[PDB]
Paper text:
As a key intermediate in the breakdown of some aromatic PAHs, salicylaldehyde can be oxidized to salicylate by the activity of salicylaldehyde dehydrogenase (SALD; EC 1.2.1.65), which is an NAD(P)+-dependent enzyme.
Polypeptide chains A and C formed the first dimer, while chains B and D formed the second homodimer. The monomer shows that the enzyme is a classical aldehyde dehydrogenase showing the typical α/β aldehyde dehydrogenase superfamily organization with three domains: catalytic, NAD+-binding and bridging domains. The biological unit (dimer) of SALDAP is formed by the oligomerization of two monomers through the bridging domain. The oligomerization domain is typical of that found in class 3 ALDHs, with the C-terminal portion of the protein pointing away from a position that favours the interaction of a dimer–dimer interface (tetramer), thus only favouring the formation of a dimer. Although the EDs were good, protocatechuic acid (PCA) was chosen as the ligand bound to the active site for refinement as it fitted the ED better. A hydrogen bond between the para-hydroxyl group of the ligand and the Asp427 side chain is indicated as a black broken line in Fig. 3(a). Interestingly, the binding of a carboxylic acid in the active site of the aldehyde dehydro­genase indicates the potential for product inhibition of the enzyme during aldehyde oxidation; this also means that the enzyme may possess carboxylic acid reductase activity. Although an NAD+ molecule was not found in the cofactor-binding site, the potential residues implicated in the interaction with NAD+ adopted a fold quite similar to those observed in other NAD+-dependent ALDH complex structures.
Residue numbers in the entry:
A (entry chain C), B (entry chain A): 5 to 470
Amino acid sequence: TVNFERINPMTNQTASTAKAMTAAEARAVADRAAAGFAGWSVLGPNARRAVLMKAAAALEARKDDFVQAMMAEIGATAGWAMFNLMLAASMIREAAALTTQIGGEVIPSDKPGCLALALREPVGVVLGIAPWNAPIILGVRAIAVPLACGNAVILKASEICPRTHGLIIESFAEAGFPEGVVNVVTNAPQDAGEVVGALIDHPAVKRINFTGSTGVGRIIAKRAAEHLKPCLLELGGKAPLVVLDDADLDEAAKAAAFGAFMNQGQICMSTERIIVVEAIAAEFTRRFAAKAQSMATGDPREGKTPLGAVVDRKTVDHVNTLIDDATAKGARIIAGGKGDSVLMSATVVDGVTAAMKLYRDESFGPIVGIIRAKDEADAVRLANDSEYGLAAAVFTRDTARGLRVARQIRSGICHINGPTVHDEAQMPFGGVGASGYGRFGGKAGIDQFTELRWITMETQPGHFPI
Amino acid sequence: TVNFERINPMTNQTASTAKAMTAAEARAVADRAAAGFAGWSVLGPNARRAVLMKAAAALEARKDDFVQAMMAEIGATAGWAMFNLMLAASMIREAAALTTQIGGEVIPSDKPGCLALALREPVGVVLGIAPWNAPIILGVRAIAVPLACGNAVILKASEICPRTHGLIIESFAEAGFPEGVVNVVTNAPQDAGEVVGALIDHPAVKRINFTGSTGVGRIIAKRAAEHLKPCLLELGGKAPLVVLDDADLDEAAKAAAFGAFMNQGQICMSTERIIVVEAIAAEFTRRFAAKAQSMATGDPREGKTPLGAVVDRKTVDHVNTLIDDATAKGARIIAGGKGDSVLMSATVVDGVTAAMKLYRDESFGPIVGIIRAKDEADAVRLANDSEYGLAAAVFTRDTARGLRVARQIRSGICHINGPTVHDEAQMPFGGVGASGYGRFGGKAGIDQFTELRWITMETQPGHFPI
């Protein structure tokens, strides 16, 4: 009996503990999922919908356990935890709504009398690896539509929030899924490679969805290639927000502040780079600096400030390194600055250049860089000067120009006059380049967790050339 | 100036020669494709359709060069070459028909006034690696829908039929595509790893489609994972045809003979395993043996027989080994037999068991093994006793039972009362397991060669929580 612990970042005392599973124990979880698949996969759409609706209600019934777990494990505000619970429950109800919408197509054939079908069928066991930053939302995203598609699931819980992720599986356990359909795997950080490797290698595991860093994503894709397993990879992001000469500067500053500092900038689509054309750069910067200065940081347990704590000291040191590298290379701090605790200030760095680590590196903290563009063509080039391509935004009162710019930006997501932080269960969500491939949400999500099969039936005798 | 050659399997003289490109020359082809992409990607659907229709007519205009090239390079009959030409031209016209059908979706949003789009956009350069067995069909499949989707393409030609594949690109060159939109890469077999590796690593190459062996597919998938590139992998298989107790035995024997021996069994979906329930095994075997015995092999240049030559001596030695092995372990030879030349007989081995090499092996030659099943449940287990899962077929007069069996067979394709050999451009085509993932054809094919983007436009001011 071996456990690992998660230390509370606000108190430095144990927040929670969980089983440090071995590769053998993780394989036995996949064997239980493999055995539960057959029964669950043949259940009708209304019966499947009814179980998923019970899971959403059971998730909402564990509200007190979820708020305590998120606040203790990741240093979240009670508001961020309630937002997580609310939206996670809505995503389960969207997955329940989709069961009668997962079907197929009838395609006309040139073979006389041939009835030809393209059917979307359940695959088997889906492995869902979820991160800690929006833990209920992303733990639920890793398994909801996979379950609605008739698959058994393994939620590979984050070592940063094992209780928050464990509570998702305990909520689903009250809904009445058959035995072995919903499962959890927990592991110590040092065993991640061997435990995740053993699950990817397991013959019953047919689809892998992973949300996390590009570096770990590439390791997962290489391990999956060894057994020809398809992956849905939601990786890093360095979201740019472009401000053109006719942008509503008040609206751009409000959208940029919300996108840069929501959840202390710990979101895959947080605003990392603000690219402003020279014509309005001084005015935008003044408005944005004043807005970032008005957003206070405070103890998340008090619930009185827009910003709470970052996940741990590693983020504090990484953000401080990015600030020191930037200012040593000529950049200027125009809001916030370096911090000595997890209660970090909303920081704005002006004069960010290609020589600085902050221009390219994913900060995952409450820091944003302002980059100067000469004109629209230069702003597009700067927005595209990144290996990443998850979310992006463009601000302009000429929305037709916003569409021309969005078409040139290389990203999976682009919001015209909206913040970079935005997601809805019915929308396809994913990246290009180093941000990965595949999409969660809507019809694209269904395609990721079903097997498309060409099934035909003859109604006449065949006419063979030989 | 370095060339490789292809030797004619019927005469043992040079059939053709082609440039043995280096990794540097292959990268320069990808640079030309990258530069041609922008212009081609913004062309309207009717203008793109008109160019593709000219490509189909230019393909048909080079008929004499295609028939000579296929017969000389792979030992094909003029019939197999004309069939390849006819169907490849039809697939280009299907790709031309799809240009007005590649669009997007408008999805309702919970954000007031937000117009939300899910757009399928051109990706960039598509690398399409095509094999030699149905060289015009597969060479065209590797690029036709990728071109309709507004991408530039690189056809990575087979070293077994470099002139047949080179003629596809010369036909497309007559259609009026912009410069750098259609390209070819040729390489000596020993340079495949370095040339294909250099193209997969190239930043402009955004999608890879590969048709070939499982072993090479796994190498391609790992190389693609290093740069997070999505792949479409069609990796062949060991197609089972199941004959149940109420099957129309005459129809099953005709479909099995056509599927086992078309193109001398050198098709990814050729019938490799016939699984017969004991109730009708003796009668099916008699009918099938009589049918296989009536299918003669002859010199493909004479054009008087249903079977021509196998691609080379390697196949002859491999099929002879499968016969020696099976008959030494108690199998029965009921049609054909061993050969001393590329003109191989249509061979049928009965009483095949898991102790014989013919039970799991991909033969890619004119040989099929008959496996005895106790009943329907045993036949399903035997059909699924393979790492492969591309095509399969089930014969039964009870088509509802055919559907129940097809649902249990693990494959990307299943034909009820049809042969295992069947493809149509509008149908999704691909495998599961060791047969790969992704699908060519229909709407699934379009999704493989487009980038799905979530684009939104606000029509009201935002309401931000911070």
